[PDB]
Every structure is written in C-alpha cells, then in structure tokens.
Amino acid sequence: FLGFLGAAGSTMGAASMTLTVQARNLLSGKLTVWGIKQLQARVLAVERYLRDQQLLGIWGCSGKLICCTNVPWNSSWSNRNLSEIWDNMTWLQWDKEISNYTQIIYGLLEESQNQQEKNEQDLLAL
Amino acid sequence: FLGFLGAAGSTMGAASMTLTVQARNLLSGQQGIKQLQARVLAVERYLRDQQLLGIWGCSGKLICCTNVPWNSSWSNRNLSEIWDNMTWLQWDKEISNYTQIIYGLLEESQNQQEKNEQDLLAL
Amino acid sequence: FLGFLGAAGSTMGAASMTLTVQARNLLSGIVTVWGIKQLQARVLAVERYLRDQQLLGIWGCSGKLICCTNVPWNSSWSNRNLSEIWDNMTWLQWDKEISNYTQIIYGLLEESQNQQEKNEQDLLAL
Amino acid sequence: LWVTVYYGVPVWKDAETTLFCASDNVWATHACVPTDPNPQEIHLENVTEEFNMWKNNMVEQMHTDIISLWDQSLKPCVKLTPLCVTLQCTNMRGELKNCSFNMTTELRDKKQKVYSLFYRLDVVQINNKEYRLINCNTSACTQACPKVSFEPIPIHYCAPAGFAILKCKDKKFNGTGPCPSVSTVQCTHGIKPVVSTQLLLNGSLAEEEVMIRSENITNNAKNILVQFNTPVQINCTRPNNNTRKSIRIGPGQAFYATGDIIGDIRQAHCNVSKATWNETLGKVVKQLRKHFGNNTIIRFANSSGGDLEVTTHSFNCGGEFFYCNTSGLFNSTWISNSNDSITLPCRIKQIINMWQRIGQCMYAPPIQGVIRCVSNITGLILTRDGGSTNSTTETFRPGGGDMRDNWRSELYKYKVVKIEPLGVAPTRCKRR
Amino acid sequence: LWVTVYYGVPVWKDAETTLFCASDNVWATHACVPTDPNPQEIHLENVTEEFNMWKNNMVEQMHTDIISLWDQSLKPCVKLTPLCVTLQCTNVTNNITDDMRGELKNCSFNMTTELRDKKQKVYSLFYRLDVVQINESNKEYRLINCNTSACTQACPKVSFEPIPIHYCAPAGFAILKCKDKKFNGTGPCPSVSTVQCTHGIKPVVSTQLLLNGSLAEEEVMIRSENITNNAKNILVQFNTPVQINCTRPNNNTRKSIRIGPGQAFYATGDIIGDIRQAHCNVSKATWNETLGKVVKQLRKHFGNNTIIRFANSSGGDLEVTTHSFNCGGEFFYCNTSGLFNSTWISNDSITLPCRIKQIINMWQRIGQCMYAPPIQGVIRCVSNITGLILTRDGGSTNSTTETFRPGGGDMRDNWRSELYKYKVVKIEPLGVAPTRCKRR
C-alpha cells in the first residue's frame, strides 16, 4: 500500500491497479475569515466531482473505473505501440502527449454512446 | 448543431437526438451569498433528478425503457402523431397531471423487478 | 404504509421492502443568523449523500439498493442462523453486533470489485 | 405502448431566482465577475412565448441590488454629525446664502470659526440670520466620498446554472402578450443605472416606431412609457466657477464646503432643440391617437406634482444633482387636420434623499469648474388625466416618482425561466 | 486498439486555491480546524517536479490572511479618539544615564471623565518618537498621527506572540514538498513528497534578521530571484542558529485612566530606579564564524577572488534601516550597525542599542495604526537568528569587491523563506488510453 498519489512515479500499467486510492481521496477525503472560504472550497470540490461524474455518465461508463468503449484509436493522436506505452511511460508523461487531442476524443465518445443508445432503443422495439 | 435550446420548437422525434446538449448544461455551464446559495441550489436540483432516475432503475442513461404499461386515460393518441406533430412543451402541457402516479408505478415496478432479481439470484 | 422511518421496529424481511421511503429523505427534507446555518447544513447533507454514493459506486453497486458480492461470509462475525436473522432480528441490534467488524468488509468489497474489473478487462481482449 | 423516461428534454417553466451581475466608482466592478468577450445567442425557432413586462421579478431584484450597491459605497465615507450647529447666514437672487458657524478641530481642545456657501433649498430658519440644515431633526447626512464616481456603468444580469433568459426579438412588441421571435441569451445587454424623472436619459432606442407601453390604457392611474426611435440631445451649463475648500473637522475627517465664486453668479440651465422636440411630440401624438381615437385633441401640461423630485426633471449632471423646470417642453395642443432652442432653468440641491428611505440622506460635495451635460432623451413617463368616458380631448402630464419604471424600459424583452429536463413518453418498446 | 477511459489516474497540474488553516491570540487559533497526528507524509519515488519560490501563490495568500486576522482582532478594542489633545510636555531628568536623554517626555493633558460634564487633569510618559511639536518651561506637543487618523489601543488580554499554524489543502488538491537538501528555490527537484499539510510556520514579524523559524540542513543556503541583478533581495539561511538576547532595563508602571463609560487608556507612570536604554546582546565569535560561512557561500556566485564587504543599512524610515521586532508586547528598534561592519580579503559580546515606539503603523496601510499599551516590569528575550535579508550594491559589470547591506521593507519575504519547499497542485483523475478491448 503506497498511499494517496504514491504510484505517480511507476509506469501506467502498474499505476492502473491503484485507481481506488486516488478516486477515494476526492470529495472531502462572516464571523471568521476561515468561515466563508472553506464553504466555497467545499462547494467547489463538490462541483468538480459532479462535473467529472456527469462527463463519465454521458459516455456510458457510470459506476465503474475502467470502461471499454468502441471508438477506434486514430494514428494521428499517437504512433506508439502497446508494448511500450504501458511498460515505459507514466501517466504524467502520457497526459502531456495527448493534451492537444482530448476534445476530439471527448466528442467521439459521447457521439458513440448516443448512437449506441439509439440503436438499443431501435433493437428493443423489434 | 442547434445550440442549448435549439430543438425546443422542432418535433420530439428530432428533439430526442440532442439530449446531451441540455444534460451537460445543468451544473456550471451557451446557457458572496448570491453566488454560493445559487450554486448549492443548482447542485441539489441536479442531485434530486439523479436520485429520481436512480430509484426507477434508469441510472446512467438518458433514454431508458421500462415495464409500466401506458394507460389510455392519460393520453389517447397515435404513436406517429405524438412523435411527429407535437413538441415537448405541448406534450408537457398536456400531461401536467398524472405525473405523480406514473412516477409511483415506475418506482414500484422497479421494486418488484429488484426483488424478483434477488429471488432469482438466491438460487 | 408505515411512513418514513416507520419500519425500525419491524424485522429485516419487512423492512427490506421499504428502503425507498428512507432513501428519498437522505437528500432533502425541507421545501440574520439562519442563512449560513442552513447553508452549511445543506452542504453537509450533500457531502454525506455524495460520499455514500461514492462508497456504493466503488464496490460496483451503483444505481441499486440491493446488490450481491462474490466475497463469502466467514461465519465469525455472526455464526447464527439465517432464519433468526431475517425473521427474529431488527437492523439496530444487527448494527450493534456487527459494527466491530465492518471496516474489514469495506476493503474486501473494494478489492473484489478491483479484481472483477481487471478480469472483465482482460476477458474482453480475446 | 410502454412508458419511456427521457432525460435532458427541452422543457421550461416560469420561475423566480437570483441573477448574478457581470461586467467587462459607486457601482462595484470588483464584485461582478468578468463576462465572456463574445456572448452566445441561440435563435429558438418555432417558439412563441408569452411575456409580461409589468410582472417580471427582474426589476424587483434589480431595484434591491441598486439600493445594496448604493448604500455600501457610503459606508467608509465620513458621517457629518458634528455639523448640525447654528448657522449665522447672510445674503440667481436669494438662492445662495453665506453661512458662518463654529466647528471643531483635529485637536479636541480647540475650535475654529468657518464659513461656507449653502443653497436656499438646503437650510431652514430656526426662528432672521438664524439657520440650520434641513435634515438635522431626522438624521446626519453621510458625505459622499470625493474620489468615487457617480457615472453609471453597464451591468449585465446573467442567469444561474439550470436557468435561462429568453430575449424577445419582435420589433412591434408592446410588453404584454405572446412574442413569436423568442431567442435565449447567456446574459443581458449593458443596462446603465441612470436615475431620472420625466425623461429617460441615456437609454435604448426603438427600432421602427415610437412605442407606447402601459399596463392598462383605459385606466388613467397607470403610467405610460414612451420610447423614441431617434434621440434628442440635451446640453447643460453650471456657469458658476465654484471653488472647493476643505474645512477639516477632526482626525482624518474633512468637510468639502463651497468657497468664493469667481466672476458673476448665474443660474444653471439646460437646453432642448426646438426643431427636434417639435415632431418628436408629433410622432408621440401620431402613435397616441391609435389608442384614444382618430379625432381627439392631444394636449400637454407642465406638471401637477407636489414634491420637488416629481415636479421637476431630476437627474445628475457631472456630479451635481439638477432639478430642471420642464415647463416649456410640455406645452402644446395638437388638433387632427431653425436654430432656436428651449432653455430650461434648473436648481441645484446638495442634501439628497435618493431612494425615499426615511432617515437616510447624503451630502454631495461641490465640483470645481463648469459642468456640462450631453445626453440623449430616449423616452418619457407620461400620465393621463381622465374624467370622461367619451372625451374629445386628452391631457398628458409628466410623471415619475418610483425608479422601477426607469429600469422597466430596459428589462422589457427579458424573461427568466427554469429548465425541467425530465419527461415520460409512450413508445412501443419494453425492458428485457 | 480502442479508447479506454480510466478514472483516478495520478495526474496533476499546477493551479491555485484558497487553502484553509489548521493548528495544534490575534491569529484566531480557536476557530481553526484541529490537527490529527497521523503519518500524513509519503514519498513519491520516480518523479521530478519544477518548483519556483518566487512565483508562489501561497505566500501571497498568507500575507492577506495575516492582514485579515490582524485587523479583525482590533475590532473589540477601544479607539483612542479623545487622546488628540494638546500636551504640555517637560523633560524628565530623574536618574538619567546620559544615553536616554531627551527620549522620554513627561506630558500632562486634560482628559475626559466617565461623567460627560466633568474633566480631569492627568499625565503620562511618552517617547520622543511619538510626539510632534505644534509651536515651531513647558512646550505644546501633539501625537504624531492625530493629524491623519486615530489609533486603536491594543487590548491587554490578547497577545502578539506567534504560535505555529498549518496550511491544509481542500479536496482535489495536493501539497508537494521539496525534500532536497541543496535546493536553491527555483528549478527541478528529484525528491518530491506529497503531504496533507505544511509544517508549523510561525508568523514572526521582522525586517532585517529572520528571528526564530526553521533552519537549513547541510550548509548555509543563498537564494535570490536573479543573482546578477542588484535590485532583488538575497535570502540567507543558516545551518546553525545565532542566539540573541533582548532586554529592557526600565521598570515601567502602567496606570489606567478612565476616558469614558467602560473605556480605559493605559498610560505610563513613574519609573522605579534608574532610566537606562534598552539593548540586545549577541556573541562575537559565533557571529564571526557565521559571517565567515556566509562569505564562503557568497564567493561561489560572485567570483572566487573578490572582496566581500558588509556595511550598515541605508534606508529612509525606521522600519527599514533599523532591526524591528516585538518582544513581550513592546516593539523594539535595534541599531545593528556593529553587526554588519567588516571586509573579507580572499567570551565577548556585541551590544546593540535599541529604541521603543508605541504608535505602530504595521503593514504600511494608509490611515490605520495601533497603540501598544505599556508592559509592567522588565522585559527579557531569547531568540534565534536563523537567516538574513541582504541587498547588493552593484556599480560595475566586473569588479574585485562587493558591498552587502541589510534589507527589509516588505514582510512577504519573511514568510517566503518558510513556504519555499511547498507547492499546490490540482488532481485530474480522468484519462484515456489505447487498449485492445472493445465494448459488446
């Protein structure tokens, strides 16, 4: 047990096993100067948790940490293979590499889930 | 692309394909005490709707199908007329009543479904 | 209809069919010096409900009131019968007799869900 | 058919909520968050929504916010409680009084004898050569701080999360009733909190015609808002070359009085061009004959109020509060068949009770030099004198009083709604 | 390959937030969150993080917090409005030791009574730095700031003694600590460890000598934003503390004068014994070795053959050119011109005279002050000199000598020597990755 955020130096294949310890320590895990701003910080933390939970729920990955989608991986985003991404890079190095192409993926996932829900509703009628 | 409320005048057949642009614009945003109380009210209003979706078993999805049969006393009209010649505002103006009883039958139907699933998995 | 919190004297079988009238009231139950008091009360209630929902979603039981888990019962926390638990016991005595050994279960469910997610992940690669 | 639950449907309901300010002095630009550089305006097609300018809760929140941001900028300012003393006062003509009086000093042991130039509208006789300030039975005035400005700045009222603001875009809208050109908006346009009476200075103009808006035309107890399509320019003078001197009361507290006036003493006045105000009243009469008949004789009278703020056109030019006698403007009769200007004499008051709150006044410090207006008359607040069910003549007099009708001429196309994104619908599909 | 969404990845970005405080007075400790003793600090193994002590938001937030908790503790205290009178002052010539001569003034004045229609004639002993003559055996004087404002008397039941505070972080944010022993403030760090909250930073107010506080580990550390620019201060951190000993030998007396209903003004009475000036003592040999180590560290940056010189301050006001601190509730002003007087070619004691003020204008705010009430009895003081603030006189691109003078002024550099090892980051738990797996 390394602790909170202690797997940041390890590779992303080994840091993918400890998502619960990072996910658990979010969401909390005038008469005085220290009164208003701590309430504002708590409300900001609640909002920042709820926006990420909504963004997970739009893609259809609600209630789970590792979610498999059906969007193919474009070669323009990266050209590295699976043998060295998960065994030579960390999450911090990987985040700086696909930072310019995250909105395209964030739109493709929600359009794929909307198409999947439409196809499910069309299939359940027959 | 229409916008935040661009499908508010079109038919409900075409307005049901853009439910993402109204779902995502409910928390922080093309939408001291006055900031904070409004933010807390918005968070609570989002959480009440999320809880209401979670009780019926429709959690995590925008479009869901249920087992509650459609009573003819609520509305007696064609499927190809409701979904192609009406608007969500007009449809909400028709069924302003009978919403609470529909919510109650959805909740109790999910309760019977959950207890039947528990009885099936008990074997 | 026993109303809200009205099944506290009943047995577990009678009180397991009425969790919806409790779970509706854990979020909200309402329609100068009283402003910041109500504000911090609402913030605390929202934080507690979100923490409970996150703790349910970690174990893999999001969106459900009753869920089953692959971890077994050691028969040491409570070695007594199934019949006298669900027909001759209330929830309060159960909490008072199990709350000694409830923090080891809360990691067992988490590690079971963490094993289940990686099993589902490498099962889908075939 | 089975019930299907849809989340995120575009359904709205009428609601009341708090609206937060945004902008890009006494009007706090610090508290207001910065707005986006470019706004977003979605044109909602096939939408007809019913508006009502006379019963929206966007002007009642605005009035409270104007009061709140007004009275929190006079909190670090000096309280003029030592100045309710006996004033020994000597003498256009009779407006100014030279008053000499005792005053304290920074040192609590010594005293000074000072003098100032007060107005006749600010002092009252104790019962001659024996005067006091007019407020010194009710409250001590709080002197306005001489660095904060009274210039109005545009503030946009943005909606919170989960709500929406529906602008109407019809060019013939009369305030009440269905608008078929409804488009949502992120935030409202720049609304300047300009306080005025009998004329709407520095406001938004109509696009096509002069618009007459009233809650009930037939009832004569309702004010009439007239909106122009072209502006009328007004220019002012305060020709007295005033000098300001700082009589220092105590430790860190000063009272900015009026010193000697260099040169002659002349009354303040401000001018309206005759060739525009004529046929501006013609457009007003032409648009007023559509509600009262084609053959009525439309008349105008000057005023019938009792208060100085109601009788005279009250506004704030350059820092000084003017009360202009608009009697040559509203003097005409209209029967259905090039450089001259109308000069309006104005009076200047220094003790100001603005929002008609009992027990709260404010002293305005003098401004050095000459003060000039330049402003657009973009509306009128008229009031009809009734009397007959079948009248062949109608008399219209300027009104005022409540300041909520000043901001109701700007928040007339806006409406705040809440979103109710939860629907149930019959569909031929069931859950496995 | 398909897109796979992971929630809870260890990814952070640099951000800012409102850090709340915790603790184990004017620093409002009673309303702070209690601190739980726990293993709060863990080590991050294979990480390097870029730190910057000069672009940190935490010190700029701590300055605002210290100001906001300073000016709210003076609200339930009496305001000295009616003290702005004319004082008839006389020289005191009782047991004067020829050094504190003309410093103390015996001033009598009229004062208000708790009954509104009565007056009293009282007297008090003021300092020379608090009175200003108005008529340019007795002369008329006035308080130095009654032309500008009215001072607020500090309440005797609150103390200005600093106690340690801890700065926690809210949810979604983390605090990273630099554990490098040779860190110079700016640059990459290979030993980064996350922590729940900072250590106990004591808000000690000083201008030239960083009294109390934390020390370095290995050697004397020299830190600057730009070591070639002479317009930026140099922070020197010691590895061994230098003990300094304050004193005030005057046995003062405090007497209350009722200036209203329930309001008292604490004036200075007579002095029992002789009147001697206050001073500070420091060891000569320890200061000599400490300045030798400082010279040896400064020769690493400024050439290995240059002549390092130390000369006294060149400020304008008393808060800059004179070492100011607070001990026992009394505010001192130490001449410290015997400390910085040396040149360095490649059991005695130093006694430094002091002066005492009572009209204090702290944080350099316009129109706000504070009156410090007198303290009965003698005042003792033991403190640790654990750092310096220096300013370099540069008048040549290449030179064989350098002159360093004591600095001061801004109080932000006092707390920048404690939060140099800390930074705050925002955790972003979402991520996407390519994996050979697809949804059904």
Ligand SMILES: *[C@@H]1O[C@H](CO)[C@@H](O[C@@H]2O[C@H](CO)[C@@H](O[C@@H]3O[C@H](CO)[C@@H](O)[C@H](O)[C@@H]3O)[C@H](O)[C@H]2NC(C)=O)[C@H](O)[C@H]1NC(C)=O
């Ligand atoms: C609106 O306009 C009318 C006239 O069109 C104004 O009424 C006039 O008011 C003045 C001064 O208030 C009166 O003058 C006084 O009259 C008598 C003459 O016997 C005398 O006591 C004084 O020496 C003084 O001159 C004037 O008579 C009066 N005119 C009429 C026809 O009644 C009225 O003041 C205006 N209302 C406003 C500005 O609210």
Ligand SMILES: *[C@@H]1O[C@H](CO)[C@@H](O[C@@H]2O[C@H](CO)[C@@H](O[C@@H]3O[C@H](CO)[C@@H](O)[C@H](O)[C@@H]3O)[C@H](O)[C@H]2NC(C)=O)[C@H](O)[C@H]1NC(C)=O
């Ligand atoms: C640096 O830290 C030292 C150690 O804490 C500080 O010295 C301490 O200062 C306080 C406040 O003046 C002294 O407390 C007072 O002492 C006497 C004896 O009890 C009495 O007047 C009061 O009851 C109160 O307790 C304390 O004795 C003193 N410690 C020592 C060992 O002398 C020092 O002030 C700090 N330097 C600063 C803030 O510049």
Ligand SMILES: *[C@@H]1O[C@H](CO)[C@@H](O[C@@H]2O[C@H](CO)[C@@H](O)[C@H](O)[C@H]2NC(C)=O)[C@H](O)[C@H]1NC(C)=O
């Ligand atoms: C607004 O109403 C118009 C007019 O009914 C709609 O336009 C028609 O939409 C149908 C359904 O897609 C098409 O088959 C027709 O060709 C359209 N045109 C005409 C002239 O009938 C329109 O869809 C509505 N909604 C909007 C713009 O959002």
Ligand SMILES: *[C@@H]1O[C@H](CO)[C@@H](O[C@@H]2O[C@H](CO)[C@@H](O)[C@H](O)[C@H]2NC(C)=O)[C@H](O)[C@H]1NC(C)=O
């Ligand atoms: C409260 O306790 C009483 C008494 O035990 C319960 O009534 C009966 O309890 C027995 C078991 O002791 C059950 O077998 C019966 O079904 C119960 N009912 C009847 C009508 O005999 C009772 O259920 C408990 N709860 C409440 C809410 O009253």
Ligand SMILES: *[C@@H]1O[C@H](CO)[C@@H](O[C@@H]2O[C@H](CO)[C@@H](O)[C@H](O)[C@H]2NC(C)=O)[C@H](O)[C@H]1NC(C)=O
């Ligand atoms: C207002 O009255 C004051 C006296 O209270 C006038 O001040 C005096 O003016 C005369 C004539 O210029 C001077 O000789 C005196 O020295 C002035 N006395 C003081 C005490 O200043 C003042 O001029 C009057 N102001 C007017 C009439 O505008």
Ligand SMILES: *[C@@H]1O[C@H](CO)[C@@H](O[C@@H]2O[C@H](CO)[C@@H](O)[C@H](O)[C@H]2NC(C)=O)[C@H](O)[C@H]1NC(C)=O
């Ligand atoms: C300013 O104060 C002075 C000093 O008291 C006033 O001068 C006296 O006023 C009283 C009023 O009762 C007279 O009886 C005295 O004759 C005045 N002179 C003296 C020398 O005492 C003066 O009136 C005050 N100024 C005002 C009220 O404008």
Ligand SMILES: *[C@@H]1O[C@H](CO)[C@@H](O[C@@H]2O[C@H](CO)[C@@H](O)[C@H](O)[C@H]2NC(C)=O)[C@H](O)[C@H]1NC(C)=O
């Ligand atoms: C008074 O009205 C005139 C005429 O409408 C205003 O002048 C216009 O100002 C707008 C500002 O966006 C410009 O886009 C127009 O080109 C101007 N028109 C002309 C003809 O100059 C003027 O700004 C108004 N004055 C005030 C103080 O509001």
Ligand SMILES: *[C@@H]1O[C@H](CO)[C@@H](O[C@@H]2O[C@H](CO)[C@@H](O)[C@H](O)[C@H]2NC(C)=O)[C@H](O)[C@H]1NC(C)=O
């Ligand atoms: C607008 O005002 C007119 C005139 O006062 C109102 O008409 C009167 O209505 C009352 C009842 O409210 C009747 O007793 C009167 O006989 C009516 N008078 C006339 C001249 O018709 C009218 O009701 C008002 N409009 C609204 C919508 O209230």
Ligand SMILES: *[C@@H]1O[C@H](CO)[C@@H](O[C@@H]2O[C@H](CO)[C@@H](O)[C@H](O)[C@H]2NC(C)=O)[C@H](O)[C@H]1NC(C)=O
């Ligand atoms: C308002 O108009 C009047 C004339 O109708 C202007 O008064 C004239 O001002 C000029 C400039 O000083 C003088 O030369 C004239 O003698 C004045 N005329 C009269 C009849 O007195 C006045 O200046 C205008 N006010 C403005 C533009 O603010």
Ligand SMILES: *[C@@H]1O[C@H](CO)[C@@H](O[C@@H]2O[C@H](CO)[C@@H](O)[C@H](O)[C@H]2NC(C)=O)[C@H](O)[C@H]1NC(C)=O
């Ligand atoms: C009001 O009076 C002042 C003081 O007499 C005038 O200020 C003078 O202005 C002229 C012209 O700019 C300068 O040359 C002088 O140096 C100023 N001072 C003095 C003491 O004469 C001011 O211009 C006047 N205002 C107006 C509008 O005429």
Ligand SMILES: *[C@@H]1O[C@H](CO)[C@@H](O[C@@H]2O[C@H](CO)[C@@H](O)[C@H](O)[C@H]2NC(C)=O)[C@H](O)[C@H]1NC(C)=O
């Ligand atoms: C109000 O003032 C403006 C200037 O501030 C006047 O406009 C001037 O009008 C004259 C006469 O036509 C022109 O020669 C000038 O070029 C104009 N100046 C500007 C800057 O446009 C305007 O006439 C005045 N209005 C009145 C007195 O009603």
Ligand SMILES: *[C@@H]1O[C@H](CO)[C@@H](O[C@@H]2O[C@H](CO)[C@@H](O)[C@H](O)[C@H]2NC(C)=O)[C@H](O)[C@H]1NC(C)=O
């Ligand atoms: C407002 O102005 C009008 C005219 O501009 C004033 O009416 C004049 O008042 C004087 C007062 O001495 C009379 O002599 C005139 O005969 C009036 N003129 C007319 C045409 O009736 C009116 O008094 C002003 N209002 C005030 C000062 O309150």
Ligand SMILES: *[C@@H]1O[C@H](CO)[C@@H](O[C@@H]2O[C@H](CO)[C@@H](O)[C@H](O)[C@H]2NC(C)=O)[C@H](O)[C@H]1NC(C)=O
């Ligand atoms: C980064 O540091 C981590 C520490 O968590 C290294 O992980 C282990 O390092 C030891 C040290 O020799 C090796 O024996 C292990 O095999 C490593 N574990 C693995 C690879 O799962 C990690 O190797 C370091 N990274 C680099 C590039 O040196």
Ligand SMILES: *[C@@H]1O[C@H](CO)[C@@H](O[C@@H]2O[C@H](CO)[C@@H](O)[C@H](O)[C@H]2NC(C)=O)[C@H](O)[C@H]1NC(C)=O
């Ligand atoms: C640190 O200080 C040096 C020395 O003053 C700065 O270098 C100067 O940069 C300016 C701007 O280009 C040049 O005009 C000077 O000639 C430079 N001086 C020398 C001695 O080279 C430098 O910019 C500062 N900042 C950093 C980040 O190094």
Ligand SMILES: *[C@@H]1O[C@H](CO)[C@@H](O[C@@H]2O[C@H](CO)[C@@H](O)[C@H](O)[C@H]2NC(C)=O)[C@H](O)[C@H]1NC(C)=O
């Ligand atoms: C600082 O040191 C000086 C000596 O360097 C001390 O002064 C002596 O104090 C003792 C009593 O402690 C007297 O007997 C001596 O006569 C004093 N000597 C001189 C030369 O004045 C002084 O007390 C010390 N101050 C402290 C420790 O606060």
Ligand SMILES: *[C@@H]1O[C@H](CO)[C@@H](O[C@@H]2O[C@H](CO)[C@@H](O)[C@H](O)[C@H]2NC(C)=O)[C@H](O)[C@H]1NC(C)=O
């Ligand atoms: C400072 O002066 C005070 C007051 O004079 C001294 O207090 C002594 O206190 C005792 C009881 O504690 C009394 O019996 C004595 O009479 C007091 N002595 C004198 C000389 O007044 C206190 O000791 C003095 N402090 C010193 C000398 O350090």
